[PDB]
PDB file of C-alpha atoms in Angstrom:
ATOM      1  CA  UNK A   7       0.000   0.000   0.000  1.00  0.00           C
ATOM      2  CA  UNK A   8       1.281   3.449  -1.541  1.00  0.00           C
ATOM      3  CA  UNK A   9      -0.011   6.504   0.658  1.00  0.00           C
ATOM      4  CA  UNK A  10      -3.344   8.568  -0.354  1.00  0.00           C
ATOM      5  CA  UNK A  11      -1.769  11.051  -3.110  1.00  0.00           C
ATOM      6  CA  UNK A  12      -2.678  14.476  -0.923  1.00  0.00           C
ATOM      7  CA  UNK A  13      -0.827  13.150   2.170  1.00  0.00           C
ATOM      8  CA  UNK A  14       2.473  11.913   0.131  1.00  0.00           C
ATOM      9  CA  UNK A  15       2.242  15.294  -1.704  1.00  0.00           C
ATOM     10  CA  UNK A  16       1.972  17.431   1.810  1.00  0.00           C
ATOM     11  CA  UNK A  17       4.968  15.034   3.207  1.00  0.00           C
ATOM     12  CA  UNK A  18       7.162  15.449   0.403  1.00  0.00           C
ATOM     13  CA  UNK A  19       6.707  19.367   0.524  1.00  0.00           C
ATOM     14  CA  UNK A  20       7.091  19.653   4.615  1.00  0.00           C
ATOM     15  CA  UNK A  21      10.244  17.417   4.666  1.00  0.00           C
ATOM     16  CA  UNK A  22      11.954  19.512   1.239  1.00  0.00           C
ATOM     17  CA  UNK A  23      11.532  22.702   3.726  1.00  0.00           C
ATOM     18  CA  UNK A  24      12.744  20.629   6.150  1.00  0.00           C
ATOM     19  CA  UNK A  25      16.090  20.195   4.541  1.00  0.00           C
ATOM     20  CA  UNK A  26      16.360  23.889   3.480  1.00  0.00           C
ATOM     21  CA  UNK A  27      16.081  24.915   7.276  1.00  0.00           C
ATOM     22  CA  UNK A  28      18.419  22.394   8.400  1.00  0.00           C
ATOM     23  CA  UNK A  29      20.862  23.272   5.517  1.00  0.00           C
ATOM     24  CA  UNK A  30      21.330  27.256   6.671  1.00  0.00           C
ATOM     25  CA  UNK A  31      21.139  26.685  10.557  1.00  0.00           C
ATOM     26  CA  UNK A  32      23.673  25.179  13.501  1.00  0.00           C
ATOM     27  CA  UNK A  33      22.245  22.419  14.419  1.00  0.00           C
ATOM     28  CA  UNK A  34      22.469  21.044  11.267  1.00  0.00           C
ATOM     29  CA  UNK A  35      18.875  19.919  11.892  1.00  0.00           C
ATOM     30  CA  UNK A  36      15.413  21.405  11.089  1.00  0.00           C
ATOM     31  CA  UNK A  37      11.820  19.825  12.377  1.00  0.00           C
ATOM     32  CA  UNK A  38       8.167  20.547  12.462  1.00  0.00           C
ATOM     33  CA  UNK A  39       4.620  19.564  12.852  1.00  0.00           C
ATOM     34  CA  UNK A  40       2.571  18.437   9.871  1.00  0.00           C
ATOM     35  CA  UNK A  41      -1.139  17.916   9.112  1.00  0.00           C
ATOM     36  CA  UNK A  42      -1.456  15.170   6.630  1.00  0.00           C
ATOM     37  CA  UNK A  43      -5.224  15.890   5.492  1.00  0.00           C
ATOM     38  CA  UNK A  44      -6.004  11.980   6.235  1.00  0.00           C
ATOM     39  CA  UNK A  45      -3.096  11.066   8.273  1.00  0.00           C
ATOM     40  CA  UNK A  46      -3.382  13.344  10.754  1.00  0.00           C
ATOM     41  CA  UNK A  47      -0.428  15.515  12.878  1.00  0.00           C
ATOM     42  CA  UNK A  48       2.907  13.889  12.199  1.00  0.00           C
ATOM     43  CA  UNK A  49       6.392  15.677  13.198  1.00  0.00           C
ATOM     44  CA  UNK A  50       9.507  15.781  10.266  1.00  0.00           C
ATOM     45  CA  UNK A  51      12.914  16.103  11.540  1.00  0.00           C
ATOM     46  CA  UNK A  52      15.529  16.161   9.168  1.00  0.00           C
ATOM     47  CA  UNK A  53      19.198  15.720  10.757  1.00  0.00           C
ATOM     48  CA  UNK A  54      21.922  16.939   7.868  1.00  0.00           C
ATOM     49  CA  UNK A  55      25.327  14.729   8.382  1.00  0.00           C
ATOM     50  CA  UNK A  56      28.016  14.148   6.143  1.00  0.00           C
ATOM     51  CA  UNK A  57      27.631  10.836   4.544  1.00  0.00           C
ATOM     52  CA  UNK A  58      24.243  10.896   4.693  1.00  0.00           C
ATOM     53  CA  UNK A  59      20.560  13.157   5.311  1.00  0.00           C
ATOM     54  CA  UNK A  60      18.605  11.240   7.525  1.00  0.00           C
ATOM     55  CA  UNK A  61      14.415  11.821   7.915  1.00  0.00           C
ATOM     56  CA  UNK A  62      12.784  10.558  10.878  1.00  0.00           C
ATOM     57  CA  UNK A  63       8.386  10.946  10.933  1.00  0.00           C
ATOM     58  CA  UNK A  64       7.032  10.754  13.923  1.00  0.00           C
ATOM     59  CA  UNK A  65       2.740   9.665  14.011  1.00  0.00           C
ATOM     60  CA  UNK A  66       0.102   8.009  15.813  1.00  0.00           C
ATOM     61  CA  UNK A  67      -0.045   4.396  15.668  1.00  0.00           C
ATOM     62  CA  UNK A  68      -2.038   3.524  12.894  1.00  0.00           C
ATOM     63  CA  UNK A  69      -0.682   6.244  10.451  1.00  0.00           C
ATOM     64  CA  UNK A  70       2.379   4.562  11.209  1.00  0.00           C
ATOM     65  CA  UNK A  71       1.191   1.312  10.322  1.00  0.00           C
ATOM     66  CA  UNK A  72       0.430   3.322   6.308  1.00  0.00           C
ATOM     67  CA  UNK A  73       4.083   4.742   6.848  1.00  0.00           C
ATOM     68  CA  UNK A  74       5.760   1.575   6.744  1.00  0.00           C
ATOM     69  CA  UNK A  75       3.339  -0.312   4.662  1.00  0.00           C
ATOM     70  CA  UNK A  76       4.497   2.964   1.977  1.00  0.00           C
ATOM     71  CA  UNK A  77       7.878   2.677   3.012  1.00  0.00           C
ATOM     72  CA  UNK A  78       9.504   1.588   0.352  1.00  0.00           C
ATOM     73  CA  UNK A  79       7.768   4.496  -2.007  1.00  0.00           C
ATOM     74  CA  UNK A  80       8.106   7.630   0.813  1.00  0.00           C
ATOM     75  CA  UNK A  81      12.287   6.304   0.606  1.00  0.00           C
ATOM     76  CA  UNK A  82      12.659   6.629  -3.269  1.00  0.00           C
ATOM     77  CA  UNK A  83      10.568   9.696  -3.737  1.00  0.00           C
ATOM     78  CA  UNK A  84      11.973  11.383  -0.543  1.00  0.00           C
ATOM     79  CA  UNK A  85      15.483  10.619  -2.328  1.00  0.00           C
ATOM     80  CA  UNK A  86      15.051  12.038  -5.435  1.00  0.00           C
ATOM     81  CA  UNK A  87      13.681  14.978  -3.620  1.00  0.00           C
ATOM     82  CA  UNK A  88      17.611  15.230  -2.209  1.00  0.00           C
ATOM     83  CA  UNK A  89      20.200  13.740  -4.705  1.00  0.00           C
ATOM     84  CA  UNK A  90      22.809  15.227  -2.967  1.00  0.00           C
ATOM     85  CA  UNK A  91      23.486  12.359  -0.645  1.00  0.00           C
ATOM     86  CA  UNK A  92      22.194   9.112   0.451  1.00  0.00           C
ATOM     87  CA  UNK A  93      18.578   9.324   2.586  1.00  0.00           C
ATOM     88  CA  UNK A  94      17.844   7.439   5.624  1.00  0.00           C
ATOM     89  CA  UNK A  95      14.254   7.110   6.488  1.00  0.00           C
ATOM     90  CA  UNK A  96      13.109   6.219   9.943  1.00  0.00           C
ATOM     91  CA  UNK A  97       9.767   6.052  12.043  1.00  0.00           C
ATOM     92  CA  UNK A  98       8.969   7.264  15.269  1.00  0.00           C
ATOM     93  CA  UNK A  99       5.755   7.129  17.573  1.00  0.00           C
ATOM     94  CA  UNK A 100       4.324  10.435  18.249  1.00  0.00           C
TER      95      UNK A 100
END
């Protein structure tokens, strides 16, 4: 199961200004709550390292559950969204 279109287009926006904050700024890491219009409120943090950009979502239970069942989609759209450097996707619980 891919995600509903709207919420993978609302993620893949949120997490691109994501990377743009985290890019300019000292911590190297930007972050921020999202409403997904079905999936509800779900926090991006982006963390900016050398060999690698790594993306962690954060979300209740059962939009988890459509995270990781779209896992392997979010991954390979959220990297050609940043072909700079290898992504790593994670998720979190809320």
């Amino acid at each position: 199961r891919p995600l509903p279109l709207a919420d993978l287009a609302r993620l893949l926006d949120a997490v691109q200004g994501r990377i743009q904050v985290a890019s300019a700024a000292e911590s190297h890491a930007a972050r921020l709550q999202v409403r997904l219009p079905q999936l509800g409120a779900v926090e991006v943090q982006v963390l900016h390292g050398h060999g690698q950009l790594q993306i962690e979502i954060s979300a209740s239970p059962g939009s988890l559950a459509l995270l990781q069942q779209a896992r392997g989609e979010l991954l390979e759209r959220l990297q050609r969204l940043h072909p700079e450097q290898p992504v790593q996707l994670t998720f979190n619980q809320q």
